Amino acid sequence: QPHKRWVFTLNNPSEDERKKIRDLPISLFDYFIVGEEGNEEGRTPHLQGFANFVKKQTFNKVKWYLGARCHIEKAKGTDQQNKEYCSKEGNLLIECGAPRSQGQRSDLSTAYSDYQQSDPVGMVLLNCCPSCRSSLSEDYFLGILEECYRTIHG
Amino acid sequence: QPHKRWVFTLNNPSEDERKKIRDLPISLFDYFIVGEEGNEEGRTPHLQGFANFVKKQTFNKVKWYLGARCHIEKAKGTDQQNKEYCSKEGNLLIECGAPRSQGQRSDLSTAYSDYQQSDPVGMVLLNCCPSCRSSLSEDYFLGILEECYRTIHG
Numbered sequence: 001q002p003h004k005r006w007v008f009t010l011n012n013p014s015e016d017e018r019k020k021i022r023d024l025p026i027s028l029f030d031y032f033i034v035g036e037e038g039n040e041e042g043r044t045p046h047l048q049g050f051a052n053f054v055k056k057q058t059f060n061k062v063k064w065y066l067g068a069r070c071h072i073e074k075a076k077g078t079d080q081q082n083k084e085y086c087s088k089e090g091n092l093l094i095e096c097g098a099p100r101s102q103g104q105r106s107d108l109s110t111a112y113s114d115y116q117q118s119d120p121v122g123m124v125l126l127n128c129c130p131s132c133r134s135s136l137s138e139d140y141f142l143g144i145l146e147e148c149y150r151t152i153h154g
Numbered sequence: 155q156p157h158k159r160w161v162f163t164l165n166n167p168s169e170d171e172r173k174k175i176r177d178l179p180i181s182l183f184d185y186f187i188v189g190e191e192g193n194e195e196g197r198t199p200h201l202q203g204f205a206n207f208v209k210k211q212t213f214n215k216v217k218w219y220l221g222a223r224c225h226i227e228k229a230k231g232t233d234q235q236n237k238e239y240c241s242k243e244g245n246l247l248i249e250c251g252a253p254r255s256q257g258q259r260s261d262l263s264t265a266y267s268d269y270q271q272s273d274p275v276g277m278v279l280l281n282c283c284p285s286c287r288s289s290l291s292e293d294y295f296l297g298i299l300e301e302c303y304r305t306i307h308g
Contacts, residue, residue, distance in 0.1 A: 022266055022267065023265065023266075023267075024266075025264035025265070026264055026265070026266055026269075026280070026284070027257065027260070027264050027284045028284075029284070030283055030284070054284055094266050096266055096269075096280055096281075097281070097282065097283060097284075098281055098282050098283065098286075104181050106181075110179035110180050110181045111177065111179075111180070112176055112177075112178075112180055112248050112250050113176065113177075115180075115250075120295040120296070120298045120299050121295075121299070123293075123294075123295035124278070124290065124293065124295050124296050124299065126180070126250055127250075127251070127252055127289065127290065127293055127295070128251070128252050128282055128283070128286035128289070128290060129184045129185075129208070129251060129252060129283055129285070129286055130180070130181045130183075130184075130208055131283070132252075132282040132283050132286040135281065135282070136278065136281065136282065139277075139278065139281055140277075141274040141275075141277035141278050141281070142274070142278050144274045144303070145274050145275070145278070145299040145300075145302070145303055146299075148299070148302045148303045148305075148306050148307075149298070149299055149302045151302075151306065152302050152305060152306070153302075
């Protein structure tokens with residue numbers, strides 16, 4: 001059976017295996033995060049990753065995209081919990097997209113009339129899906145853009 | 155059978171029926187557009203709408219969210235073609251969300267390495283769904299935010 005959500009490990013990645021994963025077209029994924037782990041000489045160097053594909057993929061398809069030596073399993077838990085797990089050693093190879101938010105414990109209004117057409121940031125948030133809106137409402141780079149807009153229109 | 159993608163018509167909407175549809179939580183939809191049509195004195199005033207729900211909905215559930223009086227049918231065509239159809243008389247009741255692009259075409263790079271961490275706009279586009287990215291890369295309000303950032307950092 002195919003699924004959209006997969007976790008994976010690759011032990012001792014080569015330069016070329018890292019480049020393959022980093023060169024995957026970002027159009028494949030709703031969300032994708034690959035962390036590089038085990039740099040310390042005690043342990044095994046390895047990629048730790050989570051892919052939420054736009055459409056369901058067979059096991060074989062996932063092997064092709066990530067590489068034949070990857071150990072691949074159906075993902076358990078929330079996109080958010082997988083984000084935290086794959087980023088806990090602070091060294092990302094690639095991160096594209098935004099985690100899917102299944103239980104929407106957002107702080108963010110669900111009322112169309114609270115999004116003011118005089119607020120570009122608010123309009124950016126209005127004009128994307130529930131998962132992307134929730135992620136972008138906390139995004140550092142959208143926060144920079146908000147700060148520049150406030151500076152000029154203040 | 156349930157589906158994400160539905161079109162609808164409501165003839166002679168009351169004030170209250172319009173307010174119901176405008177008060178729908180924006181968390182329900184990947185994309186939602188309702189236009190108000192038939193203003194001219196010859197014809198019947200009516201809502202013309204398209205909903206792409208986050209999860210699949212039965213006919214009965216769609217009736218619950220919209221009107222019971224709404225005529226509802228499964229959607230055919232792309233989200234984009236439905237957006238153009240529902241906006242052709244220039245008077246939106248509500249639009250919230252971004253159309254789902256089935257890969258279609260983008261002109262936007264699919265290479266992670268073309269999104270520069272020194273570019274906040276580029277990082278906003280990187281950090282979202284492939285469908286939200288394509289839609290936001292043409293968004294008027296993200297364009298205003300780009301313009302303010304360039305003003306300050308040019």
